[PDB]
DNA sequence: GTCGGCATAGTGACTGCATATGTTGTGTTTTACAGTATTATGTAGTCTGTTTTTTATGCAAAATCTAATTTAATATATTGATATTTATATCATTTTACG
DNA sequence: CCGTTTCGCTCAAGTTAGTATATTAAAGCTGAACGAGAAACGTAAAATGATATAAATATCAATATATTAAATTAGATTTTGCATAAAAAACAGACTACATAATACTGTAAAACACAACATATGCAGTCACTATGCCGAC
DNA sequence: CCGTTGAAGCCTGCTTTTTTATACTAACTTGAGCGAAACGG
């Protein structure tokens, strides 16, 4: 398993990395989302401070609010995809 | 357990009974295509009204393009001490140029 | 310092205490082979830095005056975005006419095999030899 | 203060009412043979 140390281990090290694995590692785990759905997320699903999640494994359907917040290793949903809106685009 | 002499021990040659195999002949049963006829087939030869496509203008919308026009910018014209570029062309260094 | 016996340990065979899963269904992970465009490199060629000196040409202030490129309009017009609608051609919606297969039915040769009396090679029936050490007997 | 009658009792065939299932998994517990530590000479 992962745990929180070895997560803030591997995000500083991912700056070889491109600039969407650092935003895809905080979305996966602010979202708990697959990495299965996670790709097929478009910023229209996104509606009224909501995201609409279609799972493609099980085919469950929910909504993530745009409210979130993991407090331990310091991330915001909302600064997460405003983030991805900036950078990546 | 080997070596020496009639008895072992399957396989092969031999001879005629016994029977499946090779022919010949009569006769029933059913396959297999030719030839004319019947009629619903698929395309053929056109007519007609609805759907589709080419076609001949029509016009509000859009802003450049050309000519009238004014003015900052450019040129003439002084005058003279001081600073910069200038003719040639072999060496030396930077930038273009194709693979 | 040394020996002897008890005690801490682990191996070996009985005596008890506890908890309970298999398939569907659909992914998710990761080693390995596969397929172009742009820029840093590099040798070679073209433009430029190197270099200096008397003579030639440009450096520039301070203001009058004729000249002119060109943005600033300001009105003129091709150009451009967008349908409207009918002439003209395409093409289902009908239908008889025409040549063509599936089928209706008569006409005829012949394939395919039982049935039956013979004819006879050949496999089977019955007995002895071929080919070479056993068994039994001596060494 | 003897003799008959009736509440009981076992044999058989039912008719129900409480306990324990099947199996790997993981230990626990009393020998006995064995090596090292610790006390007695």
Request: charged fraction near 20%; aromatic fraction near 14%; hydrophobic fraction near 40%.
């Given at each position: 398993r992962?745990?929180?140390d070895?997560?803030?281990?591997?995000?500083?090290?991912?700056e070889s990395?491109?600039?969407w694995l650092r935003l895809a590692m905080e979305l996966a785990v602010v979202t708990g989302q697959r990495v299965?759905?996670?790709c097929e997320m478009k910023w229209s699903?996104?509606?009224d401070g909501?995201?609409?999640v279609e799972q493609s494994?099980?085919?469950?359907k929910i909504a993530i609010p745009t409210a979130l917040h993991i407090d331990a290793l310091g991330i915001s949903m909302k600064e997460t995809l405003d983030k991805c809106k900036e950078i990546l685009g």
């Open positions: 992962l745990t929180a070895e997560y803030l281990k591997i995000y500083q090290a991912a990395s491109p600039c299965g759905d996670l699903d996104i509606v909501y995201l609409y494994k099980t085919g469950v």
